[PDB]
Symmetry: D2
Subunit: 296 residues, 4 copies
């Protein structure tokens, strides 16, 4: 136990009224994507990147529920802490809210409703996580880049501009909801002004690194799935996508107890205890099977 | 001493740990089925039976959230009351919990995780609602009767036995989660002894009515969909099913605002106000279109 | 000189290049919807109307394949004939191609890519089939009327105009792909002039009947599913929709063997033989179960 | 044009009666998976492995249809040839049928109903394709390894046995439907005897390489999708899986014209011509867009 290198933040704050009435009772990032709470996925992304000290930011109403779901992290070899965003005034506000949590360390922000799947994903993040200066982002080809921060490249494949929700996007490349930053991000976030939309823009954070030549924009290839959670239709597809992978394989995607176990943050003895409450359903069954099966 | 309509109950309590970890932060009946919380579907079903006075039974933990979503019903021409079920002791327990709520009235119990769709469904509920003594249930042909209460019929089509979760079902006709009762149900329920599963069984209730010759079983035809919400798989399918119908039709299934509007429990002016806070999203836009479209 | 029942047509011709490359090797109406060829669904629809004598219209290239699948109908208590449509010149062309087949009889046209599901669907088809003069069509509320023939109603609910693919639909009520005709349709069809699209339009046919006051439009309610097969997306959804119903119920939608059995066009002994060559798979096992289960 | 290094074979032969009636009219590998014929996927796998000379083996009935779909290959920079398997007497029969096509060259067999997706898939195949001696296979963790050829590993992660459809599988690792072989496979196939099931087993081919220490079994990781096409349910999931990837990305999976174009087997001028017939639908639109868009 802990009373209060790279730190993680999950920004799991309010989506406004766009998925109401589904999200009227509870924020989106506590709803299941197939067999597990949405937040398990970005949590799992951070743990895959090797990050164990992690701040979860949510609305004032829902922190108790996040706190309840995940606890202090210790049962999974994590050190979790919690903070609140009172209004949805931009994703960069994560760096103001998390300022004292970050301290003097390196950091990474993941959106709490972002789903990543694919091969060698541990290596793709460990590469960004090892770059100790500047920021690292990921660009992914999408059909509807107007909804996102859009990267423009020159003919030699070098990032030359970023634009948030452009009316005429410059490419089909969109910045995904996963960001790695050095010790400069907090101080860049403090200097931000609200945009025409009344938000502290993460795209402004990232343009400040671009303007200094310190932004690494790596291509996240078509062979990776960055799954859309923005619409009722896209939530549905995501659960369909995860279910098809888990049913085919008899292996789970973004099972935090398993990831902990593979990183050796918990031992056999602890995994076994975590299997015990859930032993009557499939998820406890999965976790027990992992004790005696070799999975390459 | 000397003496001189039908209330509804929705049971939306603990699904224990069945669907953990998806349901760890929030109870099943608030998870979305496509674009609206699951509890809207059975609420709509009672509304369609003509029932305006309704008791929602939930866990102590989740009652506030049902209340936040649903309020007192006044916005939709209903009256909603709340009660808690501290321990999931079985479905027949709704009648003890709801004894003061029911009083000397007729009742209807609906499971808070049961979705229905189909044609003349209003009329099928009308005929059970207007049967003023005894009980009515609905029998539906399912692939896996062993999971349900099962009705055995004789060669005349008459109901002759009921068995809860039989290993060797006598038919494929499962009893759906919607039950209509006369003034005898509370007394029947008080006398029940817990099953060996540690549960007060709705099927024991229906058997009492059967043994007194006061149980109408109606067939809910194959042209109706009675959807499965028991697993992560079936839940996903339930969302796909609704999405497909609403995207095809430009009409919603189980939109409580709409149903109150068509029942004339609320007027055009009242519906316009309900639309306003959701005007940016599709749900609010749909409520608005209903004002100026004849829909047959 | 001196003179003294209803045939069906299924149009399963060229979808041109719309769904190429999926449909390059094989026509649309033979692609599966879940577990059975698409053409089974509209065939089943005619069977449900009581119609036993049926002409299948396909491309010259694909007729052998319809014939290999369906034969002459004798196995299922029907009589199937075949005709070809060398150029996709429009739906009303079915009446010229099928003129000798129809003779002096009543008719019914069904599109070979149109799926229907719902309750009392038998009865809804019964009332159109038994209307012996004029034409009957069905109007269904859709999200995208602009893609269909659209019915405009006056405030009494009476059909007053029909428009093919209007840019500004007068209602959301599209005319479904199922049409019932008296002995005037062939003559109406011979007189049509091609539309500017180079097509003989079914909607022109229905307008002739409207202008003579002999067009019944019945509403196919929202409790019916009329499924979309026009796109790769909608097709996939159509398979998901059927799969969900059949997996839930342990019953099939549009199983022609079953429907002949229940119509008493074939007997138990005949159905047992049809089951045999499919006995290893689920379809054959289902046919076998139908012999020894009462299904209401 | 060509009249009749590594060669490819696609075995797209009969699945018997297990998907009847869906497959009664046409073999499975000509049915669409979402927007394209199933065979496009394994074709695309071979082209991704750098293989351009390719033999397509099908039933006698369906060769004309495969021939019709794909032609001589020349429009896509391939050299296709066709041959027939008269009865389904085992996957190893591909090497007897293809003996003279193979000649003295290296070879690779892909099953015509196998779908692969994932990142760095070009590199994973180019590694197997470069190993000039022995055979290379892939092992993938699945839920139901009894259906497949199953690999057993020792504690150091070395393949020590292969078993075809074991009643008690030794691991959850299954051999996928993609095989690379040197000049020995033809002569090993000729010496095979039929199994207890009356088939020339590909697993026997691969055990012969294992017994000689010449089988490379590489793990295909959980971050890759090997999609199941064996059941109606699994076909459906696959089309759902592909559609979700293509709709999110605005990029296609296994578009052979695109792969050809990226390998430089056809130029801009040719791609443009292939866009022309399909210009009115999305797939022609996709191909034209590829002329003027840089996709990393
Ligand atoms: C399918 N993936 C996955 C894995 N690859 N792994 C393997 C794993 C686990 C711990 C450390 C490295 C690796 Br590789 C795992 O244990 N769980 C997984 O869900 S993943 O890398 O694409 C992924 C991990 C976490 C969140 C989202 C996807
Ligand atoms: C699709 N259905 C439906 C309707 N039929 N209706 C029409 C309606 C509304 C009020 C009273 C009668 C009728 Br009919 C509606 O307004 N909303 C609906 O969702 S239903 O009858 O099958 C249904 C009602 C309530 C919950 C689930 C399905
Ligand atoms: C689900 N339906 C259905 C049925 N209702 N029936 C029952 C049936 C059969 C023959 C005659 C009347 C009736 Br009811 C059946 O045997 N197979 C069916 O698929 S349906 O009436 O909506 C339908 C029939 C034909 C094609 C598509 C749907
Ligand atoms: C999504 N994939 C994919 C690609 N990766 N590519 C990129 C590509 C194309 C040609 C040569 C190398 C690469 Br990388 C492509 O052009 N089409 C694709 O479908 S894939 O490598 O996983 C794949 C290719 C072919 C069949 C099945 C999957
Ligand atoms: Cl990639
Ligand atoms: Cl019915
Ligand atoms: Cl209806
Ligand atoms: Cl992997």
């Amino acid at each position: 136990h802990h009373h209060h290198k790279r730190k993680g933040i999950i920004l799991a704050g309010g989506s406004g009224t766009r998925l109401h009435p589904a999200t009227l009772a509870i924020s989106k990032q506590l709803l299941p994507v197939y067999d597990k709470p949405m937040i398990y996925y970005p949590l799992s992304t951070l743990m895959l990147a090797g990050i164990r000290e992690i701040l979860i930011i949510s609305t004032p109403q829902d922190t108790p529920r996040f706190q309840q779901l995940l606890g202090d992290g210790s049962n999974w070899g994590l050190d979790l802490q919690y903070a609140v965003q009172p209004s949805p005034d931009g994703l960069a506000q994560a760096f103001l809210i998390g300022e004292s949590f970050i301290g003097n360390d390196l950091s990474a922000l993941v959106l709490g409703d972002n789903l990543y799947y694919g091969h060698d994903f541990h290596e793709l993040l460990g590469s960004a996580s090892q770059r100790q200066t500047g920021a690292s982002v990921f660009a992914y080809h999408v059909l509807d880049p107007e909804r996102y921060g859009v990267v423009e490249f020159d003919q030699g494949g070098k990032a030359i501009s970023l634009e948030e929700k452009p009316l005429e996007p410059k490419s089909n490349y969109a910045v995904t909801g996963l960001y790695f930053y050095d010790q400069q991000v907090v101080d860049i976030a403090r200097d931000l002004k609200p945009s025409p939309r009344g938000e502290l823009e993460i795209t402004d954070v990232n343009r400040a690194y671009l303007e200094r030549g310190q932004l690494s924009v790596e291509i996240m290839g078509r062979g990776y799935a960055w799954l859309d959670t923005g619409t009722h239709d896209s939530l549905l597809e995501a659960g369909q996508f995860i279910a098809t992978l888990e049913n085919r394989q008899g292996l789970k995607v973004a099972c935090p107890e398993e990831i902990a176990y593979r990183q050796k943050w918990i031992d056999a003895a602890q995994l076994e205890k975590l299997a015990a409450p859930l032993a009557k359903n499939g998820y406890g069954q999965y976790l027990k099977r992992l004790l005696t099966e070799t999975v390459y």
